Amino acid sequence: HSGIDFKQLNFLTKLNENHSGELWKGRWQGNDIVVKVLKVRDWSTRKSRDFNEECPRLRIFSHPNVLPVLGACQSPPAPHPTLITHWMPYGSLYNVLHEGTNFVVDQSQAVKFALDMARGMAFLHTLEPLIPRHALNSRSVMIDEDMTARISMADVKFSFQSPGRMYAPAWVAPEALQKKPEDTNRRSADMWSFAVLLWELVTREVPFADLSNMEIGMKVALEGLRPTIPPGISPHVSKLMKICMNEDPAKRPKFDMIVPILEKMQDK
């Protein structure tokens, strides 16, 4: 549990820089990878220790719809707390749905994505305790070479990583916009996020795209802002979306309950 040696990483090309730090495409020990480099103000020995304790939980190799963190570089001795994960050719679900200049995925593929994500989340929901600060959204699911959707463990926020700032409130349950995690049923909150993903798969639109993140969180939390259920969809898809986005967290289904429903939707 010394982690990955940062010097062994082959940094090939920079993909992004943002509030979190940066992302590079690279190679390590014959793996095509991305390298997430976390920039953290007031880095301390406490935060470093925390990083080294939080990372192991993300190394999940036991489910096809979960994309593990391969490993992390501890800082020190690395320049920055860094983590690595397999490179996914299609990038995020968000990329594929919203930024897909080559092709548009069909509804059968959309149903398979929903099934893949549901299976992955049901698995993650078996963990005790749950992985903290794991938020489900289309940016935090990747699409592999064979169009398999996989929950991105490299998108789980660390305890020191932008605390008190949400960059994807549109997928967050209303209770989760306002209450501390400890004061919510986290599994029900995650089902709300899945309901928004369903809406996103049905509309092929970014939820609340015409609103800033601050507007979204403030209006959903305090003004009752909701996605409008799309017109001209089967009563079955309609009923699924509705129950997953129940205003009452206690009435939302578990992931393991919706899995069989989704399975029948591929091919009854």
Partner: protein, 124 residues
């Protein structure tokens, strides 16, 4: 510098104060919130927190700050949290103490607002 502007350029100062009212309402109105008085409306830290999120593209979970502060202390904490968000956005640590904002020191408040304006000029 800004002090010279505050203390020795009243004509400019009002043009600047004018710049700032437009600059902050450009954003807070989106929340159905209006700023008419620069002297006090940022004292409790709430609008500064909401502004930083409106300006830097994130929501602040309501459990992360005091949306309706009930004490001098909670206001201080809000301003401090806002000052931390400012530094995360790349601003240097603000010159005023968080207490100076809460105590309605106009120079202090306007300095903070001015440094925001000069940074976030082009944000829509």
């Amino acid at each position: 510098a800004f002090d010279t502007l505050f203390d020795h350029a009243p004509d400019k100062l009002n043009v600047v104060k004018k710049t700032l009212i437009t600059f902050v309402n450009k954003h807070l109105n989106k929340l159905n919130l209006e700023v008419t008085e620069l002297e006090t409306q940022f004292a409790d830290g709430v609008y500064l927190v909401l502004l930083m999120g409106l300006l830097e593209g994130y929501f602040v979970p309501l459990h992360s700050f005091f949306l309706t502060p009930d004490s001098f202390e909670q206001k201080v904490l809000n301003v401090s949290f806002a000052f931390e968000l400012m530094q995360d956005g790349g601003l240097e640590k603000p010159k005023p103490r968080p207490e100076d904002i809460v105590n309605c020191d106009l120079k202090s408040t306007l300095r903070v607002l001015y440094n925001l304006f000069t940074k976030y000029r082009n944000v829509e």
